[PDB]
Protein backbone atom coordinates (compact mmCIF):
# COMPACT_ATOMS: atom_id res chain seq x y z
CA UNK A 1 0.00 0.00 0.00
CA UNK A 2 1.30 3.43 -1.01
CA UNK A 3 0.02 6.99 -1.01
CA UNK A 4 -0.30 8.86 -4.34
CA UNK A 5 1.03 12.14 -2.87
CA UNK A 6 4.60 13.02 -1.92
CA UNK A 7 4.73 14.50 1.58
CA UNK A 8 7.88 16.39 2.64
CA UNK A 9 6.98 16.63 6.34
CA UNK A 10 10.50 16.31 7.92
CA UNK A 11 12.44 16.17 4.65
CA UNK A 12 13.17 18.98 2.19
CA UNK A 13 11.63 18.84 -1.28
CA UNK A 14 12.07 21.06 -4.35
CA UNK A 15 9.79 20.96 -7.39
CA UNK A 16 11.86 21.15 -10.58
CA UNK A 17 9.02 22.70 -12.56
CA UNK A 18 10.52 22.99 -16.06
CA UNK A 19 14.18 22.42 -15.22
CA UNK A 20 16.42 19.40 -14.94
CA UNK A 21 18.98 19.79 -12.16
CA UNK A 22 21.71 20.31 -14.79
CA UNK A 23 19.95 23.12 -16.65
CA UNK A 24 18.98 24.53 -13.25
CA UNK A 25 22.63 25.27 -12.49
CA UNK A 26 23.28 26.79 -15.93
CA UNK A 27 20.55 29.43 -15.56
CA UNK A 28 18.10 28.69 -18.35
CA UNK A 29 15.15 31.06 -18.94
CA UNK A 30 12.72 28.76 -17.12
CA UNK A 31 15.09 28.12 -14.19
CA UNK A 32 14.96 31.47 -12.41
CA UNK A 33 12.81 30.13 -9.56
CA UNK A 34 15.13 27.32 -8.45
CA UNK A 35 18.27 29.41 -7.87
CA UNK A 36 19.10 29.99 -4.21
CA UNK A 37 17.59 26.95 -2.51
CA UNK A 38 18.87 24.03 -0.45
CA UNK A 39 17.28 20.59 -0.55
CA UNK A 40 17.55 17.01 0.64
CA UNK A 41 15.63 15.45 -2.29
CA UNK A 42 15.20 17.10 -5.70
CA UNK A 43 12.15 16.03 -7.72
CA UNK A 44 12.93 15.94 -11.45
CA UNK A 45 9.83 15.91 -13.62
CA UNK A 46 9.98 13.82 -16.83
CA UNK A 47 8.29 16.73 -18.65
CA UNK A 48 11.37 18.95 -18.25
CA UNK A 49 12.38 20.21 -21.69
CA UNK A 50 15.30 22.10 -23.18
CA UNK A 51 14.76 25.85 -23.44
CA UNK A 52 18.15 27.49 -24.06
CA UNK A 53 21.02 26.81 -26.52
CA UNK A 54 21.35 23.16 -27.60
CA UNK A 55 24.27 21.62 -25.72
CA UNK A 56 25.80 18.32 -24.64
CA UNK A 57 27.59 17.44 -21.40
CA UNK A 58 30.40 14.85 -21.50
CA UNK A 59 30.24 12.72 -18.35
CA UNK A 60 26.74 14.08 -17.74
CA UNK A 61 26.08 11.36 -15.14
CA UNK A 62 28.83 12.61 -12.82
CA UNK A 63 27.79 16.27 -12.95
CA UNK A 64 24.15 15.31 -12.34
CA UNK A 65 24.91 13.29 -9.20
CA UNK A 66 27.47 15.75 -7.81
CA UNK A 67 25.06 18.67 -8.18
CA UNK A 68 22.40 16.53 -6.49
CA UNK A 69 24.35 15.19 -3.50
CA UNK A 70 25.47 18.63 -2.28
CA UNK A 71 21.99 20.09 -1.74
CA UNK A 72 23.15 23.71 -2.11
CA UNK A 73 22.21 25.84 -5.12
CA UNK A 74 23.81 29.04 -3.81
CA UNK A 75 26.04 30.74 -6.37
CA UNK A 76 29.10 32.80 -5.42
CA UNK A 77 29.40 35.95 -7.54
CA UNK A 78 33.04 36.27 -8.62
CA UNK A 79 33.98 39.19 -10.88
CA UNK A 80 36.01 37.91 -13.83
CA UNK A 81 37.86 40.42 -16.01
CA UNK A 82 38.40 39.61 -19.69
CA UNK A 83 40.98 41.42 -21.80
CA UNK A 84 40.47 42.88 -25.30
CA UNK A 85 37.26 40.93 -25.94
CA UNK A 86 33.50 41.52 -25.96
CA UNK A 87 31.49 39.70 -23.29
CA UNK A 88 27.79 38.97 -22.71
CA UNK A 89 27.07 37.36 -26.07
CA UNK A 90 23.41 36.41 -26.41
CA UNK A 91 21.56 33.96 -28.66
CA UNK A 92 18.19 33.79 -30.39
CA UNK A 93 17.54 30.10 -29.67
CA UNK A 94 17.89 31.02 -25.97
CA UNK A 95 14.89 33.34 -25.67
CA UNK A 96 14.11 34.70 -22.19
CA UNK A 97 10.94 36.83 -22.10
CA UNK A 98 11.24 37.20 -25.90
CA UNK A 99 14.55 39.03 -25.37
CA UNK A 100 17.60 37.45 -26.98
CA UNK A 101 19.35 36.14 -23.86
CA UNK A 102 21.99 33.66 -22.71
CA UNK A 103 22.62 31.37 -19.75
CA UNK A 104 22.08 33.38 -16.57
CA UNK A 105 25.20 31.82 -14.98
CA UNK A 106 27.45 31.90 -18.07
CA UNK A 107 29.24 34.38 -20.31
CA UNK A 108 29.83 34.17 -24.07
CA UNK A 109 32.91 35.92 -25.47
CA UNK A 110 33.43 37.30 -28.98
CA UNK A 111 36.24 39.20 -30.68
CA UNK A 112 36.02 42.95 -30.99
CA UNK A 113 36.62 44.35 -34.47
CA UNK A 114 40.03 42.83 -35.20
CA UNK A 115 41.41 40.34 -32.65
CA UNK A 116 40.97 37.74 -29.89
CA UNK A 117 44.27 37.75 -27.97
CA UNK A 118 45.51 35.14 -25.51
CA UNK A 119 43.49 35.21 -22.29
CA UNK A 120 45.24 34.50 -18.99
CA UNK A 121 43.29 34.81 -15.73
CA UNK A 122 43.35 32.84 -12.47
CA UNK A 123 41.34 32.67 -9.24
CA UNK A 124 43.04 30.96 -6.30
CA UNK A 125 40.65 29.46 -3.74
CA UNK A 126 41.47 29.95 -0.06
CA UNK A 127 37.93 29.52 1.26
CA UNK A 128 36.63 26.90 3.67
CA UNK A 129 34.70 25.13 0.90
CA UNK A 130 35.34 23.42 -2.41
CA UNK A 131 34.45 25.30 -5.60
CA UNK A 132 32.65 23.93 -8.66
CA UNK A 133 33.16 25.78 -11.95
CA UNK A 134 30.79 25.10 -14.86
CA UNK A 135 32.03 26.17 -18.29
CA UNK A 136 31.42 25.24 -21.91
CA UNK A 137 33.13 25.16 -25.29
CA UNK A 138 31.24 26.38 -28.36
CA UNK A 139 31.45 24.43 -31.63
CA UNK A 140 30.76 26.53 -34.76
CA UNK A 141 28.74 24.80 -37.50
CA UNK A 142 30.92 26.34 -40.23
CA UNK A 143 34.57 27.28 -40.64
CA UNK A 144 33.53 30.77 -41.71
CA UNK A 145 31.85 31.50 -38.38
CA UNK A 146 35.03 30.35 -36.63
CA UNK A 147 36.77 33.58 -37.70
CA UNK A 148 33.80 35.93 -37.29
CA UNK A 149 33.27 35.05 -33.62
CA UNK A 150 36.85 34.38 -32.50
CA UNK A 151 39.28 35.50 -35.28
CA UNK A 152 41.19 32.21 -35.13
CA UNK A 153 41.04 29.06 -37.23
CA UNK A 154 42.61 26.82 -34.49
CA UNK A 155 40.59 27.79 -31.42
CA UNK A 156 41.58 26.42 -28.04
CA UNK A 157 40.32 26.06 -24.46
CA UNK A 158 42.82 25.07 -21.74
CA UNK A 159 41.40 25.05 -18.20
CA UNK A 160 44.03 23.69 -15.81
CA UNK A 161 44.62 23.17 -12.09
CA UNK A 162 47.46 21.96 -9.86
CA UNK A 163 46.87 18.29 -10.74
CA UNK A 164 44.79 18.05 -13.93
CA UNK A 165 44.68 19.80 -17.30
CA UNK A 166 42.16 19.62 -20.15
CA UNK A 167 43.10 21.08 -23.55
CA UNK A 168 40.26 21.03 -26.11
CA UNK A 169 40.40 22.32 -29.69
CA UNK A 170 36.84 22.63 -31.05
CA UNK A 171 35.76 20.57 -34.06
CA UNK A 172 33.64 22.27 -36.73
CA UNK A 173 30.65 20.52 -38.24
CA UNK A 174 26.99 20.86 -39.14
CA UNK A 175 24.55 19.28 -36.66
CA UNK A 176 20.82 18.70 -37.20
CA UNK A 177 18.44 21.58 -36.58
CA UNK A 178 17.60 22.03 -32.89
CA UNK A 179 15.61 25.28 -32.57
CA UNK A 180 17.12 26.71 -35.78
CA UNK A 181 20.68 26.33 -34.42
CA UNK A 182 23.22 23.89 -35.87
CA UNK A 183 25.83 24.65 -33.19
CA UNK A 184 26.59 22.71 -30.02
CA UNK A 185 28.36 23.45 -26.73
CA UNK A 186 30.46 20.96 -24.74
CA UNK A 187 30.26 21.62 -20.99
CA UNK A 188 33.03 20.48 -18.64
CA UNK A 189 33.53 20.73 -14.88
CA UNK A 190 36.57 21.04 -12.62
CA UNK A 191 36.50 20.84 -8.82
CA UNK A 192 38.92 23.00 -6.81
CA UNK A 193 39.64 22.05 -3.20
CA UNK A 194 40.95 24.57 -0.65
CA UNK A 195 44.59 25.31 -1.41
CA UNK A 196 44.07 24.54 -5.12
CA UNK A 197 44.00 26.99 -8.03
CA UNK A 198 41.96 27.13 -11.23
CA UNK A 199 43.35 28.63 -14.46
CA UNK A 200 41.50 29.80 -17.57
CA UNK A 201 43.31 30.24 -20.89
CA UNK A 202 41.51 30.37 -24.24
CA UNK A 203 42.48 31.68 -27.67
CA UNK A 204 38.86 31.15 -28.77
CA UNK A 205 35.52 29.36 -28.37
CA UNK A 206 34.91 29.66 -24.62
CA UNK A 207 31.63 29.89 -22.70
CA UNK A 208 33.06 31.59 -19.62
CA UNK A 209 31.50 31.23 -16.16
CA UNK A 210 30.25 34.13 -14.05
CA UNK A 211 31.44 32.49 -10.81
CA UNK A 212 31.40 29.18 -8.96
CA UNK A 213 29.23 27.12 -6.62
CA UNK A 214 29.48 26.07 -2.98
CA UNK A 215 30.20 22.39 -2.31
CA UNK A 216 29.13 20.61 0.89
CA UNK A 217 30.21 17.03 0.20
CA UNK A 218 29.47 13.99 2.37
CA UNK A 219 25.99 15.38 3.01
CA UNK A 220 22.64 13.63 2.62
CA UNK A 221 21.15 14.88 -0.65
CA UNK A 222 19.71 12.93 -3.57
CA UNK A 223 17.51 13.16 -6.67
CA UNK A 224 14.36 11.39 -7.85
CA UNK A 225 12.52 11.30 -11.18
CA UNK A 226 8.73 11.04 -10.96
CA UNK A 227 5.44 12.49 -12.18
CA UNK A 228 3.53 12.18 -8.88
CA UNK A 229 3.07 15.65 -7.30
CA UNK A 230 3.64 16.89 -3.76
CA UNK A 231 0.93 16.62 -1.12
CA UNK A 232 0.47 17.75 2.49
CA UNK A 233 0.58 14.60 4.65
CA UNK A 234 3.35 13.45 7.03
CA UNK A 235 6.00 10.87 6.12
CA UNK A 236 9.77 10.39 6.19
CA UNK A 237 9.78 7.95 3.25
CA UNK A 238 9.31 8.54 -0.47
CA UNK A 239 9.38 6.02 -3.31
CA UNK A 240 9.41 6.05 -7.11
CA UNK A 241 5.63 6.59 -7.30
CA UNK A 242 4.53 7.82 -3.87
CA UNK A 243 5.06 7.94 -0.13
CA UNK A 244 4.94 4.97 2.25
CA UNK A 245 3.50 5.31 5.77
CA UNK A 246 3.38 1.70 6.97
CA UNK A 247 5.00 -0.03 9.95
CA UNK A 248 5.51 -3.45 8.34
CA UNK A 249 9.24 -3.87 7.58
CA UNK A 250 8.44 -6.08 4.55
CA UNK A 251 6.49 -4.19 1.88
CA UNK A 252 6.54 -5.06 -1.84
CA UNK A 253 6.15 -1.68 -3.55
CA UNK A 254 9.39 -0.62 -5.22
CA UNK A 255 13.18 -0.84 -5.08
CA UNK A 256 13.81 2.93 -5.00
CA UNK A 257 13.44 4.14 -1.40
CA UNK A 258 14.79 7.23 0.36
CA UNK A 259 14.99 7.42 4.15
CA UNK A 260 14.18 5.11 7.05
CA UNK A 261 11.99 2.88 4.92
CA UNK A 262 10.89 -0.76 5.17
CA UNK A 263 12.87 -3.15 3.00
CA UNK A 264 11.63 -5.06 -0.06
Amino acid sequence: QHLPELCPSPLRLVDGQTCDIVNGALGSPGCDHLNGAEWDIFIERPTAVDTCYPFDVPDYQSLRSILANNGKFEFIAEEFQWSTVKQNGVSASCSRANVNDFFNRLNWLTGKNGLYPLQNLTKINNGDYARLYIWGVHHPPNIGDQTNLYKNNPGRVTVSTKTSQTSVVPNIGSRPKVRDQEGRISFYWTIVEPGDLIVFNTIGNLIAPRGHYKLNSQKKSTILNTAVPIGSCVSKCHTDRGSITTTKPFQNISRISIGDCPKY
Partner: antibody
Amino acid sequence: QVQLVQSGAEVKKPGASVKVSCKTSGYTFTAYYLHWVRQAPGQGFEWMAWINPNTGDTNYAQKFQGRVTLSRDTSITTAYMELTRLRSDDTAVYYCAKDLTLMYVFDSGWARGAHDYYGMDVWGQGTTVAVSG
Amino acid sequence: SALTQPASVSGSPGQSVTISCTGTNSDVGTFDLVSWYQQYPGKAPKLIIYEGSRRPSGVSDRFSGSKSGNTASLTISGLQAEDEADYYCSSYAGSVVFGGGTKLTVLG
Protein backbone atom coordinates in the same frame (compact mmCIF):
# COMPACT_ATOMS: atom_id res chain seq x y z
CA GLN B 1 35.14 45.13 -52.80
CA VAL B 2 32.36 47.00 -50.98
CA GLN B 3 30.36 49.82 -52.58
CA LEU B 4 27.35 52.01 -51.78
CA VAL B 5 25.12 53.34 -54.57
CA GLN B 6 22.97 56.42 -53.94
CA SER B 7 20.10 57.95 -55.89
CA GLY B 8 20.77 60.85 -58.23
CA ALA B 9 20.86 64.54 -57.41
CA GLU B 10 17.51 66.20 -56.75
CA VAL B 11 16.16 69.75 -56.52
CA LYS B 12 13.07 70.47 -54.43
CA LYS B 13 11.06 73.59 -53.77
CA PRO B 14 10.77 74.41 -50.04
CA GLY B 15 8.04 72.57 -48.18
CA ALA B 16 8.23 69.49 -50.43
CA SER B 17 9.45 66.00 -49.51
CA VAL B 18 12.60 64.10 -50.52
CA LYS B 19 13.36 60.37 -50.69
CA VAL B 20 16.89 58.99 -51.14
CA SER B 21 17.86 55.34 -51.68
CA CYS B 22 21.08 53.54 -50.73
CA LYS B 23 21.81 50.11 -52.22
CA THR B 24 24.56 48.01 -50.64
CA SER B 25 26.72 45.40 -52.36
CA GLY B 26 29.40 42.91 -51.38
CA TYR B 27 28.42 42.53 -47.72
CA THR B 28 25.60 41.01 -45.68
CA PHE B 29 23.13 43.89 -45.51
CA THR B 30 21.51 42.63 -42.29
CA ALA B 31 24.75 42.09 -40.32
CA TYR B 32 25.56 45.78 -39.76
CA TYR B 33 23.85 49.02 -38.77
CA LEU B 34 23.19 51.83 -41.24
CA HIS B 35 23.80 55.56 -40.73
CA TRP B 36 22.61 58.69 -42.52
CA VAL B 37 24.66 61.90 -42.40
CA ARG B 38 24.70 65.20 -44.30
CA GLN B 39 27.49 67.67 -45.09
CA ALA B 40 26.64 71.29 -45.86
CA PRO B 41 28.75 73.35 -48.29
CA GLY B 42 31.97 74.38 -46.56
CA GLN B 43 30.69 72.77 -43.34
CA GLY B 44 31.26 69.56 -41.40
CA PHE B 45 29.21 66.38 -41.19
CA GLU B 46 26.01 66.04 -39.16
CA TRP B 47 24.47 62.67 -38.32
CA MET B 48 20.70 62.18 -38.53
CA ALA B 49 19.54 58.66 -37.60
CA TRP B 50 20.33 54.95 -37.78
CA ILE B 51 18.26 51.91 -38.73
CA ASN B 52 18.53 48.19 -37.93
CA PRO B 53 18.37 46.21 -41.21
CA ASN B 54 17.54 42.94 -39.41
CA THR B 55 14.66 44.25 -37.27
CA GLY B 56 13.71 47.68 -38.65
CA ASP B 57 14.44 49.47 -35.37
CA THR B 58 15.24 53.16 -35.73
CA ASN B 59 16.47 56.04 -33.59
CA TYR B 60 16.36 59.65 -34.80
CA ALA B 61 17.90 62.91 -33.65
CA GLN B 62 15.86 65.62 -31.96
CA LYS B 63 16.42 68.06 -34.84
CA PHE B 64 14.92 65.62 -37.37
CA GLN B 65 12.39 63.76 -35.19
CA GLY B 66 8.96 64.23 -36.76
CA ARG B 67 10.20 65.00 -40.29
CA VAL B 68 12.62 62.25 -41.32
CA THR B 69 11.59 58.59 -41.53
CA LEU B 70 13.74 55.60 -42.48
CA SER B 71 12.80 52.38 -44.25
CA ARG B 72 14.57 49.14 -45.15
CA ASP B 73 14.18 46.50 -47.86
CA THR B 74 15.52 43.02 -47.14
CA SER B 75 15.65 42.03 -50.77
CA ILE B 76 18.32 43.78 -52.88
CA THR B 77 19.69 45.81 -49.97
CA THR B 78 18.09 49.15 -50.64
CA ALA B 79 17.63 51.44 -47.67
CA TYR B 80 15.63 54.65 -47.88
CA MET B 81 15.34 57.95 -46.02
CA GLU B 82 12.26 60.16 -46.44
CA LEU B 83 12.37 63.73 -45.14
CA THR B 84 9.05 65.59 -44.93
CA ARG B 85 8.52 69.34 -44.52
CA LEU B 86 12.03 70.23 -45.65
CA ARG B 87 13.01 73.89 -45.74
CA SER B 88 15.50 76.26 -47.35
CA ASP B 89 17.94 75.60 -44.49
CA ASP B 90 18.50 71.93 -45.42
CA THR B 91 20.91 72.21 -48.35
CA ALA B 92 23.44 69.42 -47.84
CA VAL B 93 25.10 66.38 -49.38
CA TYR B 94 23.38 63.37 -47.80
CA TYR B 95 25.51 60.27 -47.20
CA CYS B 96 24.71 56.67 -46.32
CA ALA B 97 27.34 54.77 -44.35
CA LYS B 98 27.74 51.33 -42.77
CA ASP B 99 28.89 51.04 -39.16
CA LEU B 100 31.93 48.88 -38.49
CA THR B 101 30.31 46.90 -35.66
CA LEU B 102 28.94 43.48 -36.51
CA MET B 103 25.77 42.77 -34.53
CA TYR B 104 24.49 39.38 -35.72
CA VAL B 105 25.72 36.00 -36.94
CA PHE B 106 22.84 34.15 -38.57
CA ASP B 107 24.34 30.65 -38.77
CA SER B 108 25.58 30.56 -35.16
CA GLY B 109 22.64 32.64 -33.90
CA TRP B 110 24.96 35.09 -32.15
CA ALA B 111 23.96 38.66 -31.28
CA ARG B 112 25.75 41.62 -29.74
CA GLY B 113 24.50 42.84 -26.36
CA ALA B 114 24.17 46.54 -27.13
CA HIS B 115 25.64 48.85 -29.78
CA ASP B 116 28.79 50.96 -29.53
CA TYR B 117 30.14 53.40 -32.11
CA TYR B 118 33.60 52.82 -33.56
CA GLY B 119 33.60 54.25 -37.09
CA MET B 120 31.83 54.46 -40.46
CA ASP B 121 34.14 52.48 -42.73
CA VAL B 122 32.17 52.63 -46.01
CA TRP B 123 30.43 55.72 -47.39
CA GLY B 124 28.10 56.32 -50.30
CA GLN B 125 29.16 58.44 -53.26
CA GLY B 126 26.77 61.13 -52.02
CA THR B 127 23.45 62.66 -53.08
CA THR B 128 23.55 66.40 -53.76
CA VAL B 129 20.22 67.89 -52.61
CA ALA B 130 19.38 71.52 -53.39
CA VAL B 131 16.49 73.35 -51.70
CA SER B 132 15.82 76.83 -53.11
CA GLY B 133 12.62 78.81 -53.58
CA SER C 1 29.28 67.53 -27.78
CA ALA C 2 31.95 69.83 -29.23
CA LEU C 3 34.89 67.80 -30.63
CA THR C 4 36.76 70.90 -31.76
CA GLN C 5 39.50 70.71 -34.40
CA PRO C 6 42.00 73.30 -35.66
CA ALA C 7 40.96 75.35 -38.67
CA SER C 8 44.16 74.65 -40.64
CA VAL C 9 47.52 72.89 -40.44
CA SER C 10 50.60 74.00 -42.39
CA GLY C 11 53.65 71.80 -42.80
CA SER C 12 56.71 71.32 -45.00
CA PRO C 13 57.21 68.08 -46.97
CA GLY C 14 59.29 65.35 -45.40
CA GLN C 15 58.44 66.39 -41.83
CA SER C 16 55.49 65.45 -39.60
CA VAL C 17 52.20 67.27 -39.01
CA THR C 18 50.01 66.87 -35.92
CA ILE C 19 46.26 67.54 -35.89
CA SER C 20 44.87 67.56 -32.35
CA CYS C 21 41.30 67.02 -31.15
CA THR C 22 39.65 68.26 -27.96
CA GLY C 23 36.09 68.41 -26.68
CA THR C 24 34.41 69.65 -23.51
CA ASN C 25 34.52 68.42 -19.91
CA SER C 26 34.38 64.58 -19.94
CA ASP C 27 32.69 64.52 -23.36
CA VAL C 28 35.69 63.11 -25.22
CA GLY C 29 37.27 61.51 -22.14
CA THR C 30 34.89 58.58 -22.55
CA PHE C 31 37.05 55.51 -23.32
CA ASP C 32 38.17 57.38 -26.41
CA LEU C 33 38.39 54.65 -29.10
CA VAL C 34 38.05 57.50 -31.58
CA SER C 35 38.05 57.40 -35.40
CA TRP C 36 39.41 59.63 -38.16
CA TYR C 37 38.73 60.34 -41.82
CA GLN C 38 40.32 61.88 -44.92
CA GLN C 39 38.22 63.72 -47.51
CA TYR C 40 39.66 64.91 -50.82
CA PRO C 41 38.06 67.89 -52.59
CA GLY C 42 34.78 66.84 -54.17
CA LYS C 43 35.15 63.23 -53.01
CA ALA C 44 33.63 60.96 -50.41
CA PRO C 45 35.59 60.57 -47.16
CA LYS C 46 37.51 57.44 -46.23
CA LEU C 47 38.15 55.90 -42.82
CA ILE C 48 41.87 56.00 -42.06
CA ILE C 49 42.10 55.11 -38.34
CA TYR C 50 39.48 53.55 -36.06
CA GLU C 51 39.67 52.97 -32.30
CA GLY C 52 42.17 55.86 -32.10
CA SER C 53 45.27 54.00 -33.29
CA ARG C 54 44.37 51.04 -35.54
CA ARG C 55 44.39 51.11 -39.36
CA PRO C 56 42.29 49.08 -41.83
CA SER C 57 43.56 47.09 -44.80
CA GLY C 58 44.90 49.61 -47.31
CA VAL C 59 46.25 52.57 -45.33
CA SER C 60 50.03 52.83 -45.30
CA ASP C 61 51.94 53.05 -42.02
CA ARG C 62 52.37 56.84 -42.35
CA PHE C 63 49.00 57.50 -40.67
CA SER C 64 48.94 57.19 -36.88
CA GLY C 65 47.03 58.44 -33.86
CA SER C 66 47.76 58.57 -30.16
CA LYS C 67 46.21 59.28 -26.76
CA SER C 68 47.13 62.54 -24.98
CA GLY C 69 44.83 62.84 -21.97
CA ASN C 70 41.75 64.73 -23.13
CA THR C 71 43.42 65.40 -26.51
CA ALA C 72 43.60 62.94 -29.41
CA SER C 73 46.17 63.60 -32.13
CA LEU C 74 47.03 62.34 -35.61
CA THR C 75 50.55 62.22 -37.05
CA ILE C 76 51.45 62.17 -40.76
CA SER C 77 55.20 61.50 -40.78
CA GLY C 78 55.74 60.46 -44.41
CA LEU C 79 56.96 62.61 -47.27
CA GLN C 80 53.63 64.31 -47.71
CA ALA C 81 52.79 63.86 -51.39
CA GLU C 82 48.97 63.92 -51.84
CA ASP C 83 47.95 64.48 -48.21
CA GLU C 84 46.38 67.81 -49.08
CA ALA C 85 42.81 67.20 -47.91
CA ASP C 86 40.26 67.96 -45.20
CA TYR C 87 40.69 65.72 -42.15
CA TYR C 88 37.66 65.11 -39.92
CA CYS C 89 37.14 63.28 -36.63
CA SER C 90 34.28 61.44 -34.95
CA SER C 91 33.51 60.03 -31.49
CA TYR C 92 30.43 59.05 -29.45
CA ALA C 93 28.85 61.58 -27.06
CA GLY C 94 25.23 60.42 -26.96
CA SER C 95 24.75 60.90 -30.69
CA VAL C 96 27.83 60.34 -32.85
CA VAL C 97 29.80 63.58 -32.69
CA PHE C 98 31.76 65.06 -35.60
CA GLY C 99 34.70 67.44 -35.71
CA GLY C 100 34.89 70.66 -37.68
CA GLY C 101 37.67 69.54 -40.01
CA THR C 102 41.28 70.52 -40.72
CA LYS C 103 42.76 71.15 -44.17
CA LEU C 104 46.36 70.11 -44.80
CA THR C 105 48.46 72.17 -47.22
CA VAL C 106 51.36 70.58 -49.08
CA LEU C 107 54.16 73.11 -49.35
CA GLY C 108 54.80 74.92 -52.63
